[PDB]
């Protein structure tokens, strides 16, 4: 099973200048809980944005060019990325925009955080078709001293 996990600001913005400009510790904690002990697939730009391997997960990087770090696994196509995960129950796709586009048609589950924040950005989560997806979990949180925007955790499953 393939799942996508992402945090979206208003208008599906996910990034600007190869960064995420907000800081929401509660969402990063949600990301860690839902990805720990699973393989994670990311594109090369997202790898550069994170800047280090994510511990406790098999890190798989998509790039058309040879890898430059043997602490992670480098693959050259979507099918190779999936194969490199082995026989696991759930593969997590962690972006970015180009990678999400390619994996969306193959995904059964979306873990989305909706952040109430207006961000100028240059990268968006794919338009998906709402009729294809059932909301099975949602949890709203107001802003607090640690998290400066309100946010909604949602899990959707392909109908
Ligand atoms: N808010 C969120 O949830 C979230 C999550 C992830 C990322 N982001 C943001 O998203 C932005 C990065 O997204 P992006 O769309 O620019 O880039 P990306 O999807 O992270 O990376 C694209 C790169 O991945 C490689 N690639 C993708 N598909 C491939 C394929 N089928 N075969 C081989 N290589 C493939 C290529 O690398 P080569 O050029 O080396 O071939 C391509 O240039 C940043 O702003 C980041 O902060 C946000
Ligand atoms: N909901 C969501 N939020 C994100 O921030 C996110 N980020 C990415 C890609 N970028 C990043 C950037 C940093 C870390 C990171 O530092 N993660 C630590 C945080 C642990 C914690 O804060 O408790 C990790 O070990 O996962 C992960 C992904 C992909 N999907 C996402 N999905
Ligand atoms: Mn092929
Ligand atoms: Mn197999
Ligand atoms: Mn806000």
Overall description:
Helix 2 (44-50) links the parallel strand 3 and strand 4 (59-62). It is globular and about 40 Å long. It has helices at residues 25-35, 44-50, 78-84, 97-103, and strands spanning 2-8, 13-15, 40-43, 59-62, 73-75, 91-93, 109-115, 123-124, 133-141, 151-158. With 159 residues, the chain is of the alpha/beta class. The longest helix is centred in the N-terminal third of the chain and has 11 residues, at 25-35. It has one domain (1-159). Helices cover 20% and strands 31% of the residues. An 8-stranded mixed β-sheet has the order 5-4-3-6-1-7-10-9, with helices on both faces. The chain has 4 helices and 10 strands, in the order E-E-H-E-H-E-E-H-E-H-E-E-E-E. Residues 77, 79 line the site of one manganese (II) ion (MN). Belongs to the dihydrofolate reductase family.
Question: What descriptive keywords fit this protein?
Answer:
methotrexate resistance; one-carbon metabolism; trimethoprim resistance; methotrexate binding; alpha/beta; binds folic acid; binds NADP nicotinamide-adenine-dinucleotide phosphate; two-stranded antiparallel sheet; 159 residues; 8-stranded mixed sheet
Helix content: 10-25%
> Could you describe the largest sheet, including whether it forms a barrel?
8 strands, mixed
Main β-sheet, spatial strand arrangement: 5-4-3-6-1-7-10-9
Radius of gyration: 15 Å
Give the structural class: alpha/beta
Portion in strands: 25-35%
Ligands, deduplicated: NADP nicotinamide-adenine-dinucleotide phosphate, folic acid, manganese (II) ion
Order of helices and strands: EEHEHEEHEHEEEE
Distance between the termini: 14 Å
Number of strands: 10
Q: Tell the overall outline.
A: globular
The tally of structural domains comes to 1
Number of helices: 4
């Amino acid at each position: 099973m393939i799942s996508l996990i992402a945090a979206l600001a208003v208008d599906r913005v996910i990034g600007m200048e190869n960064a995420m400009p907000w800081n929401l510790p509660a969402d990063l904690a949600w990301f860690k809980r839902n990805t720990l002990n699973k393989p994670v697939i990311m594109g090369r730009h997202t790898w550069e944005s994170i800047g280090r391997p994510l511990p406790g997960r098999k890190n798989i990087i998509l790039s058309s060019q040879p890898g430059t770090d043997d602490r992670v696994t480098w693959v050259k196509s979507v099918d190779e990325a999936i194969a490199a995960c082995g026989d696991v129950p759930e593969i997590m796709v962690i972006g970015g925009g180009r990678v999400y586009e390619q994996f969306l048609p193959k995904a059964q589950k979306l873990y989305l955080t909706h952040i109430d924040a207006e961000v100028e950005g240059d990268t968006h989560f794919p338009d998906y078709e709402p009729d294809d997806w059932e909301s099975v979990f949602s949890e709203f949180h107001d802003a607090d001293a640690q998290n400066s925007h309100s946010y909604c955790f949602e899990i959707l499953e392909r109908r």
